[PDB]
Structure 1
Amino acid sequence: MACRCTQLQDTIDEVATQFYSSIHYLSSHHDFVSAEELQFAQRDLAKDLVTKFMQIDTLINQLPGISTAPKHQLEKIKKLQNSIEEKQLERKSLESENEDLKLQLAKRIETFGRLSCVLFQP
């Protein structure tokens, strides 16, 4: 995955909605004779939300491209192409360079296939 700060945003605006979830427990539950336990649920949110925030900071800790220099990270990609673009046809040239011998060598395997057939029937 990537753009994981947005995944953190999933723990921001959506957590902001979680505050809205926390909101809906006091509409009329008081004098209409638990909410005391719901306060412990508020403590549970004090745990959860804040720890989620800590998690947010932890993913802040390792933002990809810590060098943060696209102006030069693209240059990194330029050097990487200075490798790869050279390697392209070179690595694939080996294929034909091999088959030019090895196909006929395989037919040689077929010729000793002839002789194997000779061995089949003494």
Structure 2
Amino acid sequence: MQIDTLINQLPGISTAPKHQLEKIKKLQNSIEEKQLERKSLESENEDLKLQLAKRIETFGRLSCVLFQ
């Protein structure tokens, strides 16, 4: 009985992989372009981070010296 009910649980699927394969290709292209966007915005990010880091460093040494 368990095997029977599991056979009913079984959803019918096309043995042909064309639909799946096409889905696959869409996802790969999609993650590719999203990865490019991430890369551009990530280089700009790290540049920004360097800038703010310099301003930080000025602050820290200046503050320490002046108050102490």
Structure 2 CA distance for partners of 1:87 and 1:72, relative to 1, 3 Å = same
Partner SS for 1:81: helix
Percent sequence identity over matched residues?
Answer: 100
1:99 matched residue in structure 2: 46
Displaced runs of 4 or more, over 3 A: 54-69
Q: Larger relative contact order (C-alpha < 8 A, sep ≥ 6)?
A: 1
Structure 2 CA distance for partners of 1:83 and 1:67, relative to 1, 3 Å = farther
Q: TM-score, normalised by structure 1?
A: 0.43
Aligned residues: 68
Output the CA distance in 2 between the equivalents of 1:115 and 1:82: 50
Larger fraction in helix? 2
Structure 1 spans left out of the alignment, 5+ residues: 1-53
Question: Which whole-Å deviations, capped at 9, do the CAs of 1:50-71 have from their partners, x for residues lacking one?
Answer: xxxx444555456589465411
Structure 2 CA distance for partners of 1:105 and 1:58, relative to 1, 3 Å = farther
RMSD: 2.8
Q: Aligned-pair distance for 1:77?
A: 0.8
Structure 2 CA distance for partners of 1:74 and 1:114, relative to 1, 3 Å = same
Structure 2 spans left out of the alignment, 5+ residues: none
Q: TM-score, normalised by structure 2?
A: 0.68
